């Protein structure tokens, strides 16, 4: 069963907002990335020989390249200013829950945004950086994240601390 | 303070399905996609519409150009099986409404057939679906959803069919 | 007053070249 796919991903990369912006346009045919436009290069560059005809074609056209090089400004920085109003400052407060399993203490951190988070297990007020098992950051696909940070010990007062950009102060849940 | 983000416009055209898609991505999440057949902008979260807007006919034009380019790419010159993970969105409590997530990942071409199964029979209600989402590489991922009421009597399956599969697989889930 | 988004307009690529 043959199939054919023309796939293009135009990526705006912001290393610190609009202070440093890099445009990366990536062309794909079937399972193969063949062409790229890096704004740090200024021209098209073939990733594979299939993309070379398009590179030589478009790179020989001054006006094309001129419009491309400006898209760091005309498209990337244009859209960032807009998204900076609701996407960048978006904050969803995490729900934290502790429950035993099998022992295995489970700290469930649910429905939070953005993904930047830090979860620590404490034993009697002292951090435990050993025996930790995690599912890692899990993307729910609806702009929320979840994660399971589990401690693998046999118990007096265990504590799970969660730090997050949506919190002015760390959230704490204890388990006696 | 430092704000690092990656906004991605992702579009494609597929043969012989003759289907095209167009979407924006923000740090891994969908901002919106354009319904090509209806020429309308579909936001991932409804609230987004108060802040931004997109002229959907712009995407229709791109797909028209992509469709023509695909013919060029065809003249100029296997399948990848998906990973399927079935999990809950929130911690599962009996009697407390929740959502099962069927995560299809690392596959190509962007065409799948997903069927939610409650107790061995299909479910057409309370089911949600995403468009084909971008990855860092050349492959796609996709989210399928099912609202459900947790109980010890029920078991769930997510049946995913793809051209990269000799046989449709079903990932199981129960309380 | 929702701000209109900008987007990348796709480009036409030509034929006339073949690969083995």
């Amino acid at each position, epitope marked *: 069963r043959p199939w054919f796919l023309e796939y293009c991903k135009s990526e705006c990369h912001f290393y610190n907002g609009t202070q440093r912006v890099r445009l990366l346009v990536r062309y794909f045919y079937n399972l193969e990335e063949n062409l790229r436009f890096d704004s740090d290069v200024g021209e098209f560059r073939a990733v594979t020989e299939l993309g070379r005809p398009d590179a030589e074609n478009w790179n020989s*056209q001054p*006006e*094309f390249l*001129e*419009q*491309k*090089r*400006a*898209e760091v*400004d*005309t*498209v990337c*920085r*244009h859209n960032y200013e807009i998204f900076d109003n609701f996407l960048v400052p978006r904050r969803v407060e995490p729900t934290v829950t502790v429950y035993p399993t099998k022992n295995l203490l489970v700290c469930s951190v649910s429905d939070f945004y953005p993904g930047n988070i830090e979860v620590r297990w404490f034993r009697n007020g002292k951090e435990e950086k050993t025996g930790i098992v995690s599912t890692g950051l899990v993307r729910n696909g609806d702009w929320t994240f979840q994660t399971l940070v589990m401690l693998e010990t046999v118990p007096e007062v265990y504590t799970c601390q969660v730090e997050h950009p949506s919190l002015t102060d760390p959230v704490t849940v204890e388990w006696k | 303070i430092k704000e690092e983000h990656t906004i991605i416009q992702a579009e494609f055209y597929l043969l012989p399905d003759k289907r095209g898609e167009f979407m924006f991505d923000f740090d891994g999440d969908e901002i919106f996609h354009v319904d090509i057949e209806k020429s309308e902008t579909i936001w991932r979260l409804e609230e987004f519409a108060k802040f931004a807007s*997109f*002229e*959907a*006919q*712009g*995407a*229709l*034009a791109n797909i*028209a*150009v992509d469709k*023509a380019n695909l013919d060029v790419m065809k003249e100029r010159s296997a399948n990848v099986a998906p990973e399927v993970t079935v999990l809950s969105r929130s911690p599962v409590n009996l009697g407390e409404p929740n959502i099962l997530i069927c995560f299809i990942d690392k596959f190509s071409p962007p065409v799948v057939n997903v069927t939610w199964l409650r107790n061995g029979r299909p479910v057409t209600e309370g089911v949600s679906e995403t468009v084909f989402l971008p990855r860092d590489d050349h492959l796609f991922r996709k989210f399928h959803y099912l609202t459900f009421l947790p109980s010890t009597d029920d078991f769930y399956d997510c049946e995913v069919d793809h051209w990269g599969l000799e046989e449709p697989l079903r990932k199981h889930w129960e309380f | 007053p929702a701000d*209109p*988004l*900008a*987007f990348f*307009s*796709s*480009a*036409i690529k030509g034929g006339g070249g073949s690969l083995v």
Partner: T-cell receptor
Amino acid sequence: DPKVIQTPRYLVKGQGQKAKMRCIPEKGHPVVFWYQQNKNNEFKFLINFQNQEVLQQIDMTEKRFSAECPSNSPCSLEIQSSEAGDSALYLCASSLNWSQDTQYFGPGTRLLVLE
Amino acid sequence: QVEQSPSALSLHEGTGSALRCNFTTTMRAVQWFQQNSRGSLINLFYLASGTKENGRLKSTFNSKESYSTLHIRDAQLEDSGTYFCAALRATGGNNKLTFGQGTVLSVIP
């Protein structure tokens, strides 16, 4: 330099008559545009082409106009039923690319629709 | 939307002036035309950034500040005509040039 050919230079029609205008894009240009320029120097986009295929057109063009860009024949724009408000300079433009570089305009057709 | 100024300009032969266009939204690139007596649009400039120079003409376009200019020096008789700026809306779905009001330029012999 790209040259775009348009015929006829001038054109007069009575209300209800068809008004056909022809255009020959620059050799090698796959993309063709049509604009309206009235007496107030206002420009209105009508329709664009990628080779033989119509890609975009406004509502007025779909209902009242009939545009075509076949091989074996020059491009054409035709008003099916000419009205007084159709009187304008109909400009044809071709481009090497879809939206990435300069559009080159022809001499245009000065259409005048009388009662 | 595009705002062009001045509406009209009468320049003595051999002297110079400048036209301006402000854009209310983001433009991918700007085109400058001269529409002569015949009514045919002559391409003067295409620029998506910076400054370009073409004979006695000169043009600057700044995407961030959303404006473009056209400078005319040493005015000749053939410079007469209506000058238009035109740009592509980067936020526009319809692929088209959006034109300015126009500058009707007359050269005093």
